[PDB]
Short mmCIF file of C-alpha atoms (C1' of nucleotides) and ligand atoms in Angstrom, two decimals:
data_model
loop_
_atom_site.label_atom_id
_atom_site.label_comp_id
_atom_site.label_asym_id
_atom_site.label_seq_id
_atom_site.Cartn_x
_atom_site.Cartn_y
_atom_site.Cartn_z
CA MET A 1 -11.75 21.10 8.66
CA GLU A 2 -8.97 21.21 11.29
CA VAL A 3 -5.34 20.11 11.46
CA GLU A 4 -5.19 18.09 14.71
CA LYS A 5 -1.98 16.10 14.32
CA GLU A 6 1.23 16.79 12.42
CA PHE A 7 4.75 15.40 11.95
CA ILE A 8 7.48 17.56 10.38
CA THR A 9 10.92 16.09 9.66
CA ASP A 10 14.01 18.01 10.78
CA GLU A 11 14.81 19.04 7.20
CA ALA A 12 11.26 20.39 6.73
CA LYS A 13 11.45 22.32 10.03
CA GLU A 14 14.68 23.95 8.85
CA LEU A 15 12.98 25.27 5.68
CA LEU A 16 9.81 26.35 7.49
CA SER A 17 11.88 28.53 9.80
CA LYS A 18 14.41 29.92 7.33
CA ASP A 19 12.73 29.92 3.92
CA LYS A 20 9.86 32.28 3.09
CA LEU A 21 8.72 30.31 0.01
CA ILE A 22 8.30 27.15 2.10
CA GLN A 23 6.49 29.25 4.76
CA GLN A 24 4.17 30.54 2.00
CA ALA A 25 3.83 27.02 0.61
CA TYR A 26 3.03 25.61 4.04
CA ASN A 27 0.50 28.40 4.65
CA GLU A 28 -1.35 27.64 1.41
CA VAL A 29 -1.65 23.91 2.15
CA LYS A 30 -2.92 24.37 5.72
CA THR A 31 -5.54 26.90 4.69
CA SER A 32 -6.59 24.48 1.94
CA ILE A 33 -6.88 21.34 4.08
CA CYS A 34 -8.99 23.35 6.52
CA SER A 35 -11.31 24.38 3.69
CA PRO A 36 -13.55 21.27 3.49
CA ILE A 37 -16.97 21.88 5.04
CA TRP A 38 -20.01 19.70 5.71
CA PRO A 39 -22.77 19.91 4.85
CA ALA A 40 -22.55 22.45 1.99
CA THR A 41 -24.65 24.86 4.06
CA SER A 42 -22.17 24.97 6.97
CA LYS A 43 -19.04 27.08 7.56
CA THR A 44 -17.45 24.10 9.35
CA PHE A 45 -16.93 20.39 8.77
CA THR A 46 -19.27 18.28 10.83
CA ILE A 47 -19.18 14.49 10.58
CA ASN A 48 -22.27 12.33 11.05
CA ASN A 49 -21.51 9.93 13.91
CA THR A 50 -24.51 7.58 13.80
CA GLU A 51 -22.44 4.44 13.22
CA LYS A 52 -18.87 3.24 12.65
CA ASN A 53 -17.86 3.66 8.97
CA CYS A 54 -21.16 5.39 8.14
CA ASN A 55 -19.78 8.09 5.82
CA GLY A 56 -18.30 7.73 2.35
CA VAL A 57 -15.22 9.80 1.56
CA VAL A 58 -15.49 11.13 -2.04
CA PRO A 59 -16.70 14.74 -1.33
CA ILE A 60 -14.01 15.50 1.32
CA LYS A 61 -11.19 16.48 -1.06
CA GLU A 62 -13.22 18.94 -3.13
CA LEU A 63 -12.74 22.28 -1.36
CA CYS A 64 -9.12 21.47 -0.56
CA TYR A 65 -8.38 21.03 -4.27
CA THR A 66 -10.44 24.11 -5.24
CA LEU A 67 -8.45 26.48 -3.03
CA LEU A 68 -5.13 24.89 -4.05
CA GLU A 69 -6.07 25.07 -7.73
CA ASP A 70 -8.29 28.13 -8.23
CA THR A 71 -6.93 30.42 -5.52
CA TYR A 72 -3.34 29.22 -5.07
CA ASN A 73 -2.69 28.10 -8.64
CA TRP A 74 -1.42 24.62 -7.74
CA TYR A 75 -1.03 21.93 -10.39
CA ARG A 76 -3.27 18.84 -10.03
CA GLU A 77 -2.18 15.38 -11.13
CA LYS A 78 1.43 16.34 -11.83
CA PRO A 79 3.37 13.46 -13.40
CA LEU A 80 6.91 12.96 -12.13
CA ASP A 81 9.71 12.60 -14.72
CA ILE A 82 11.14 9.55 -12.99
CA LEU A 83 7.72 7.92 -13.31
CA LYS A 84 6.37 8.71 -16.76
CA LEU A 85 9.46 9.88 -18.64
CA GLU A 86 12.23 7.52 -17.54
CA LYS A 87 10.58 4.42 -16.05
CA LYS A 88 7.35 4.86 -18.01
CA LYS A 89 5.24 3.39 -15.21
CA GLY A 90 3.02 4.76 -12.46
CA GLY A 91 0.73 7.78 -12.31
CA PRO A 92 1.11 11.44 -11.16
CA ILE A 93 1.09 12.93 -7.65
CA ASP A 94 -2.02 14.79 -6.40
CA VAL A 95 -0.62 18.34 -6.43
CA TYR A 96 2.53 20.24 -7.18
CA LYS A 97 3.61 23.87 -7.42
CA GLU A 98 6.74 25.92 -8.02
CA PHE A 99 7.45 28.73 -5.59
CA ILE A 100 9.75 31.26 -7.21
CA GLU A 101 11.42 34.53 -6.27
CA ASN A 102 14.60 36.01 -7.78
CA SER A 103 16.92 33.05 -8.57
CA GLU A 104 15.46 30.85 -5.82
CA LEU A 105 13.05 28.07 -6.74
CA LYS A 106 11.23 25.72 -4.37
CA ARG A 107 9.13 22.84 -5.68
CA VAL A 108 6.53 21.27 -3.41
CA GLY A 109 4.95 17.88 -4.03
CA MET A 110 1.87 16.79 -2.14
CA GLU A 111 -0.63 13.99 -1.77
CA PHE A 112 -4.06 14.20 -0.12
CA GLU A 113 -5.12 10.82 1.22
CA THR A 114 -8.58 9.42 1.75
CA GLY A 115 -7.88 6.17 -0.09
CA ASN A 116 -7.04 2.92 1.71
CA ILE A 117 -4.26 3.22 4.30
CA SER A 118 -2.16 1.05 1.97
CA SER A 119 -2.64 3.67 -0.75
CA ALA A 120 -0.86 6.18 1.54
CA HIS A 121 2.30 4.05 1.52
CA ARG A 122 2.36 4.34 -2.28
CA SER A 123 1.83 8.11 -1.94
CA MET A 124 4.73 8.39 0.49
CA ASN A 125 6.97 6.29 -1.76
CA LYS A 126 6.11 8.28 -4.87
CA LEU A 127 6.98 11.52 -3.07
CA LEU A 128 10.16 9.89 -1.69
CA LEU A 129 11.03 8.92 -5.25
CA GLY A 130 10.35 12.48 -6.41
CA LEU A 131 12.52 13.83 -3.59
CA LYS A 132 15.41 11.42 -4.29
CA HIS A 133 15.41 12.33 -7.97
CA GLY A 134 15.40 16.06 -7.24
CA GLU A 135 12.00 16.90 -8.74
CA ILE A 136 10.46 18.32 -5.55
CA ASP A 137 12.14 20.06 -2.61
CA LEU A 138 9.38 19.23 -0.11
CA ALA A 139 6.72 16.52 0.17
CA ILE A 140 3.53 16.71 2.23
CA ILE A 141 0.78 14.17 2.86
CA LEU A 142 -2.70 15.12 4.11
CA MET A 143 -4.98 12.53 5.71
CA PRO A 144 -7.73 12.18 8.34
CA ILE A 145 -6.90 11.26 11.93
CA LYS A 146 -8.28 8.04 13.42
CA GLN A 147 -11.10 9.73 15.31
CA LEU A 148 -12.52 11.13 12.07
CA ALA A 149 -11.64 8.06 9.97
CA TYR A 150 -13.70 5.92 12.39
CA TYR A 151 -16.79 7.45 10.80
CA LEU A 152 -15.49 7.12 7.26
CA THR A 153 -15.27 4.14 4.89
CA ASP A 154 -13.48 1.20 6.55
CA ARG A 155 -9.67 1.24 6.33
CA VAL A 156 -9.10 4.68 4.85
CA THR A 157 -5.87 6.58 5.49
CA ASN A 158 -5.49 7.71 9.08
CA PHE A 159 -2.53 9.62 10.57
CA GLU A 160 -1.92 7.17 13.44
CA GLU A 161 -1.68 4.08 11.18
CA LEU A 162 0.85 5.57 8.72
CA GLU A 163 2.79 7.07 11.68
CA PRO A 164 4.95 3.96 12.33
CA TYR A 165 6.39 4.54 8.86
CA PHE A 166 7.13 8.26 9.03
CA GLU A 167 10.77 7.48 9.86
CA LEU A 168 11.31 5.95 6.43
CA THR A 169 11.53 9.61 5.34
CA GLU A 170 14.70 10.41 7.30
CA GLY A 171 17.11 12.94 5.81
CA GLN A 172 14.37 14.29 3.56
CA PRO A 173 12.04 17.33 3.92
CA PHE A 174 8.60 15.81 4.57
CA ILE A 175 5.49 16.81 6.52
CA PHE A 176 2.49 14.71 7.56
CA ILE A 177 -0.79 16.39 8.41
CA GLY A 178 -3.76 14.70 10.05
CA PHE A 179 -7.10 16.52 9.78
CA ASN A 180 -10.25 16.39 11.86
CA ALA A 181 -13.88 17.51 11.69
CA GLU A 182 -14.96 20.44 13.86
CA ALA A 183 -18.04 18.64 15.21
CA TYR A 184 -19.36 15.09 15.54
CA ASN A 185 -23.13 14.83 15.48
CA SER A 186 -26.01 12.84 14.08
CA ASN A 187 -27.73 16.08 13.02
CA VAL A 188 -26.08 16.15 9.61
CA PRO A 189 -26.51 14.12 6.40
CA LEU A 190 -24.31 11.08 5.75
CA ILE A 191 -21.55 11.68 3.20
CA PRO A 192 -22.71 9.41 0.35
CA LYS A 193 -20.89 6.19 -0.54
CA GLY A 194 -19.85 4.74 -3.86
CA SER A 195 -20.48 1.19 -5.06
CA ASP A 196 -16.73 0.57 -4.88
CA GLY A 197 -15.10 -2.70 -3.99
CA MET A 198 -17.14 -4.84 -1.59
CA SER A 199 -20.10 -2.46 -1.32
CA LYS A 200 -23.36 -4.40 -1.44
CA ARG A 201 -24.05 -2.37 -4.56
CA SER A 202 -20.98 -3.54 -6.51
CA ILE A 203 -21.42 -6.10 -9.28
CA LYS A 204 -20.04 -9.47 -8.19
CA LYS A 205 -20.17 -12.05 -10.98
CA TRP A 206 -19.25 -14.96 -8.68
CA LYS A 207 -22.30 -16.08 -6.70
CA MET B 1 4.23 -21.84 -11.10
CA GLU B 2 7.24 -20.24 -12.76
CA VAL B 3 9.48 -17.46 -11.50
CA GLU B 4 9.74 -15.15 -14.54
CA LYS B 5 10.95 -11.83 -13.19
CA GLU B 6 13.20 -11.00 -10.29
CA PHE B 7 15.12 -8.09 -8.84
CA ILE B 8 17.92 -8.79 -6.40
CA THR B 9 19.62 -5.79 -4.80
CA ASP B 10 23.42 -5.89 -4.74
CA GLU B 11 23.40 -6.40 -0.99
CA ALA B 12 21.22 -9.48 -1.46
CA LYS B 13 23.30 -10.77 -4.38
CA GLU B 14 26.39 -10.67 -2.18
CA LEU B 15 24.65 -12.57 0.64
CA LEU B 16 23.39 -15.15 -1.88
CA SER B 17 26.98 -15.69 -3.05
CA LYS B 18 28.91 -15.62 0.24
CA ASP B 19 26.31 -17.03 2.67
CA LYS B 20 24.99 -20.61 2.48
CA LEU B 21 22.12 -20.06 4.92
CA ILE B 22 20.81 -17.23 2.73
CA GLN B 23 21.40 -19.55 -0.22
CA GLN B 24 19.25 -22.20 1.48
CA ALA B 25 16.56 -19.64 2.37
CA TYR B 26 16.30 -18.56 -1.25
CA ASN B 27 16.00 -22.13 -2.50
CA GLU B 28 13.20 -22.89 -0.06
CA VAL B 29 11.36 -19.75 -1.24
CA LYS B 30 12.04 -20.53 -4.91
CA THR B 31 10.73 -24.09 -4.58
CA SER B 32 7.71 -22.90 -2.59
CA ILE B 33 6.67 -20.21 -5.09
CA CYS B 34 6.95 -22.77 -7.93
CA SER B 35 4.85 -25.37 -6.09
CA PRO B 36 1.39 -23.90 -6.81
CA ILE B 37 -0.53 -25.85 -9.48
CA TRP B 38 -4.08 -25.18 -10.63
CA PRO B 39 -6.55 -28.17 -10.81
CA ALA B 40 -5.46 -29.63 -7.44
CA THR B 41 -4.95 -32.85 -9.44
CA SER B 42 -2.95 -31.18 -12.23
CA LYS B 43 0.79 -31.35 -12.67
CA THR B 44 1.27 -27.61 -13.32
CA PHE B 45 -0.50 -24.30 -12.79
CA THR B 46 -2.96 -23.58 -15.58
CA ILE B 47 -5.01 -20.42 -15.18
CA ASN B 48 -8.50 -19.93 -16.61
CA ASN B 49 -8.17 -17.10 -19.15
CA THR B 50 -11.82 -16.59 -20.19
CA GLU B 51 -12.05 -12.99 -18.93
CA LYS B 52 -10.16 -10.10 -17.37
CA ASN B 53 -9.96 -10.52 -13.56
CA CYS B 54 -11.91 -13.81 -13.67
CA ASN B 55 -9.94 -15.55 -10.84
CA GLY B 56 -9.60 -15.03 -7.10
CA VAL B 57 -6.10 -14.79 -5.59
CA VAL B 58 -6.33 -16.68 -2.28
CA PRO B 59 -6.03 -20.33 -3.40
CA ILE B 60 -2.95 -19.43 -5.51
CA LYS B 61 -0.94 -19.02 -2.27
CA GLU B 62 -1.95 -22.22 -0.42
CA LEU B 63 0.69 -24.61 -1.70
CA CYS B 64 3.48 -22.05 -1.40
CA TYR B 65 2.62 -21.30 2.24
CA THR B 66 2.04 -24.98 3.08
CA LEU B 67 5.46 -26.04 1.74
CA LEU B 68 7.24 -23.20 3.55
CA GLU B 69 5.47 -23.92 6.82
CA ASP B 70 5.19 -27.69 6.90
CA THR B 71 8.25 -28.79 4.91
CA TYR B 72 10.66 -25.92 5.51
CA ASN B 73 9.50 -24.81 8.99
CA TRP B 74 8.84 -21.15 8.12
CA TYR B 75 6.59 -19.24 10.52
CA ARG B 76 3.64 -16.94 9.87
CA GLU B 77 2.99 -13.61 11.54
CA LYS B 78 6.29 -12.50 13.03
CA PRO B 79 5.65 -9.17 14.75
CA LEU B 80 8.47 -6.66 14.45
CA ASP B 81 9.80 -5.15 17.69
CA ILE B 82 9.90 -1.69 16.12
CA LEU B 83 6.17 -2.09 15.47
CA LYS B 84 4.90 -4.26 18.35
CA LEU B 85 7.19 -2.84 21.06
CA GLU B 86 8.56 0.62 20.21
CA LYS B 87 5.82 2.14 18.05
CA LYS B 88 3.13 -0.18 19.35
CA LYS B 89 1.39 0.09 15.98
CA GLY B 90 1.36 -2.13 12.90
CA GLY B 91 0.78 -5.76 12.00
CA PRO B 92 3.33 -8.58 11.70
CA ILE B 93 5.32 -9.91 8.74
CA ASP B 94 3.69 -12.56 6.51
CA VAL B 95 6.34 -15.30 6.57
CA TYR B 96 9.43 -15.57 8.75
CA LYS B 97 12.15 -18.06 9.55
CA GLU B 98 15.42 -18.05 11.45
CA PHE B 99 18.23 -20.00 9.79
CA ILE B 100 20.94 -21.50 11.98
CA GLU B 101 24.29 -23.16 11.40
CA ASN B 102 26.34 -23.20 14.60
CA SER B 103 26.79 -19.65 16.00
CA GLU B 104 25.21 -18.01 12.95
CA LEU B 105 21.59 -16.85 12.83
CA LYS B 106 19.97 -15.60 9.61
CA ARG B 107 16.51 -14.06 9.87
CA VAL B 108 14.52 -13.85 6.67
CA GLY B 109 11.38 -11.77 6.40
CA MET B 110 8.98 -12.34 3.55
CA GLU B 111 5.60 -11.14 2.33
CA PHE B 112 3.56 -13.00 -0.29
CA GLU B 113 1.66 -10.09 -1.81
CA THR B 114 -1.64 -10.86 -3.55
CA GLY B 115 -3.31 -7.81 -2.07
CA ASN B 116 -3.90 -4.53 -3.87
CA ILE B 117 -0.72 -3.07 -5.41
CA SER B 118 -0.88 -0.27 -2.79
CA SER B 119 -0.65 -2.97 -0.09
CA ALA B 120 2.66 -4.06 -1.68
CA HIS B 121 4.14 -0.66 -0.79
CA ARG B 122 3.16 -1.38 2.81
CA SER B 123 4.78 -4.82 2.61
CA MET B 124 8.03 -3.39 1.24
CA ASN B 125 8.07 -0.53 3.75
CA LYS B 126 7.46 -2.98 6.62
CA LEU B 127 10.33 -5.23 5.45
CA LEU B 128 12.42 -2.06 5.04
CA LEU B 129 11.62 -1.11 8.67
CA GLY B 130 12.60 -4.58 9.87
CA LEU B 131 15.76 -4.35 7.77
CA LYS B 132 16.67 -0.84 8.92
CA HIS B 133 16.34 -1.84 12.58
CA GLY B 134 18.39 -5.04 12.25
CA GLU B 135 15.48 -7.41 12.87
CA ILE B 136 15.99 -9.25 9.58
CA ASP B 137 18.94 -9.85 7.27
CA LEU B 138 16.95 -10.37 4.10
CA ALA B 139 13.56 -9.30 2.76
CA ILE B 140 11.58 -11.11 0.08
CA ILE B 141 8.39 -10.18 -1.73
CA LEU B 142 6.46 -12.67 -3.87
CA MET B 143 3.95 -11.38 -6.41
CA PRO B 144 2.52 -12.51 -9.77
CA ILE B 145 3.61 -10.80 -12.97
CA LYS B 146 1.38 -8.43 -14.96
CA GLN B 147 0.34 -11.11 -17.49
CA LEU B 148 -0.87 -13.41 -14.73
CA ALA B 149 -2.45 -10.61 -12.71
CA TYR B 150 -4.53 -9.61 -15.75
CA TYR B 151 -6.65 -12.68 -15.08
CA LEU B 152 -6.60 -12.18 -11.30
CA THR B 153 -8.73 -9.97 -9.05
CA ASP B 154 -8.58 -6.38 -10.33
CA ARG B 155 -5.61 -4.33 -9.14
CA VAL B 156 -3.67 -7.15 -7.44
CA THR B 157 -0.01 -6.55 -6.68
CA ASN B 158 2.08 -7.26 -9.79
CA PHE B 159 5.86 -7.27 -10.39
CA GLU B 160 5.88 -4.56 -13.07
CA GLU B 161 3.75 -2.13 -11.09
CA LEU B 162 5.89 -2.27 -7.94
CA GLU B 163 9.04 -2.17 -10.08
CA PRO B 164 9.43 1.64 -10.25
CA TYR B 165 9.75 1.52 -6.47
CA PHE B 166 12.38 -1.23 -6.14
CA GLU B 167 15.03 1.49 -5.95
CA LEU B 168 13.72 2.57 -2.54
CA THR B 169 15.22 -0.63 -1.10
CA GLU B 170 18.72 0.71 -1.81
CA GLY B 171 21.62 -0.20 0.44
CA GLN B 172 19.51 -3.00 1.90
CA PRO B 173 19.35 -6.75 1.10
CA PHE B 174 16.01 -7.29 -0.73
CA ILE B 175 14.53 -9.76 -3.26
CA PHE B 176 11.49 -9.22 -5.49
CA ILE B 177 10.10 -12.33 -7.19
CA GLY B 178 7.55 -12.29 -10.02
CA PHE B 179 5.74 -15.54 -10.79
CA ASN B 180 3.57 -16.66 -13.70
CA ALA B 181 1.48 -19.72 -14.60
CA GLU B 182 2.74 -22.31 -17.08
CA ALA B 183 -0.43 -22.31 -19.13
CA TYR B 184 -3.57 -20.30 -19.88
CA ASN B 185 -6.68 -22.22 -20.83
CA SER B 186 -10.44 -21.93 -20.57
CA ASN B 187 -10.86 -25.61 -19.76
CA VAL B 188 -9.51 -25.36 -16.20
CA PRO B 189 -11.97 -24.35 -13.44
CA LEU B 190 -12.02 -20.77 -12.18
CA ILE B 191 -10.08 -20.00 -9.02
CA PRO B 192 -12.99 -19.01 -6.71
CA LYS B 193 -13.46 -15.52 -5.21
CA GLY B 194 -14.79 -14.65 -1.77
CA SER B 195 -15.19 -17.32 0.91
CA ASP B 196 -15.29 -20.22 -1.55
CA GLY B 197 -11.58 -19.72 -2.16
CA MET B 198 -10.53 -19.35 1.44
CA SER B 199 -8.77 -22.37 2.92
CA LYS B 200 -9.74 -22.97 6.51
CA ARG B 201 -6.24 -24.27 7.09
CA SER B 202 -4.54 -23.57 10.40
CA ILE B 203 -1.25 -21.82 9.71
CA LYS B 204 2.04 -22.04 11.67
CA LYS B 205 1.91 -18.89 13.81
CA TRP B 206 5.20 -17.61 15.19
CA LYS B 207 3.58 -17.01 18.56
CA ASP B 208 3.11 -20.77 18.78
CA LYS B 209 6.87 -21.50 18.67
CA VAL B 210 9.75 -22.96 20.78
"C1'" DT C 1 -11.25 2.62 17.07
"C1'" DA C 2 -6.67 -3.44 15.13
"C1'" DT C 3 -4.73 -4.90 10.49
"C1'" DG C 4 -3.52 -7.05 6.02
"C1'" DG C 5 -6.26 -7.84 2.80
"C1'" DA C 6 -9.73 -9.00 -1.48
"C1'" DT C 7 -12.36 -6.89 -4.58
"C1'" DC C 8 -14.60 -3.83 -7.67
"C1'" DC C 9 -14.70 1.46 -9.35
"C1'" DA C 10 -14.20 5.47 -12.07
"C1'" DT C 11 -11.54 7.77 -15.78
"C1'" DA C 12 -8.42 7.29 -19.59
"C1'" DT D 1 -4.53 -0.06 -21.88
"C1'" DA D 2 -3.22 1.64 -17.15
"C1'" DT D 3 -3.44 3.64 -12.37
"C1'" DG D 4 -5.00 5.94 -8.29
"C1'" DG D 5 -9.38 5.25 -5.47
"C1'" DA D 6 -12.99 3.32 -2.50
"C1'" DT D 7 -15.74 -0.16 0.07
"C1'" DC D 8 -16.34 -4.12 2.93
"C1'" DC D 9 -13.97 -8.82 4.75
"C1'" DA D 10 -11.90 -12.33 8.01
"C1'" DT D 11 -9.22 -12.66 12.13
CA1 CA E 301 -3.89 11.23 -7.41
CA1 CA E 302 -5.04 11.13 -3.23
#
DNA sequence: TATGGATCCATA
DNA sequence: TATGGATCCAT
């Protein structure tokens, strides 16, 4: 997979240029988001482009989470204290890791988004909450760009649609990364779809 | 319907105490969110409680919207300049009205959220954007409470679930309203899901104003 | 290729 | 029991 678009707040740029741990942290996330391949036999991510919204999205996150977890030792589904300790409501963020050296400690929160675009607003808010309460020093969201999302399940998170809201992160170290497939062709298999929501396969007890 | 839970930021409290137009705005919203009644013929809103998620959410909003639009002159689909003009990306606000008393104008943005809880974060962030850029002076979000939502379409926005995030509206005038039915019974018809529960009512679009 | 939903899923 | 995801829908 490729990182095509990217927004980095002023506070995040300052860390990326002056702090090694954030540079290391940033390096590990980029290499991870680029990891997804398709099909399993390929070295690159190719998206089937037969029709609009033809591919499901479930398998996309796999390799990204494997590298982050297995190789980089990141923590999956990390619950925030503000959420499950104090307020006792809401779930954990996708990934989290503590970058340490000497007395310095940098905590990075992150969310990978292939859920509905509205789900990305929650993700941004959770990370904003975690940043406000001093649990993470940097927040990062990963999501497909519109060109790629056009071939994925209708209404999934796309960089361009969440973009008008990036400013709601002012004064806080945040980074938004939009990813894209390396090739677009009808020579590959369709990424399978679930029976979720309004899929013709979902059980609807109303008709 | 009943308004059972509510969070009012301190900035909104102040406006509600010192400003009569904001006081009027609130009362129109309050009366509108209490207007829904199940059995169109019924006095109050009784919700069928036979199963988990047994009712659709669309008809629940009809009376509230209709009172705000037709009786109180609120408009639907007010595009924000920051979104329509500057960023040229993003949809409009759900309900909008400009209050006037002489030289004073009070713009109130409001979203009636019966979408997925994740959609509520979009609603709040959009009102926050309108607020931050001085396009509105007060934001309002209507949503059922957890107990009511248990019998509504799975994962619908609910007061308690958005609650952890109310603090993100800090330093800005915002109102969160949680409503609930007056009764739960199995002898009232199910609120239909899908197209059956869609009203083909023409709404008062802001674009069609003067 | 726009946009806020409405609904049902999968895991706990 | 609760919570983050995923899939189409109506305009
Ligand atoms: Ca997650
Ligand atoms: Ca995610």
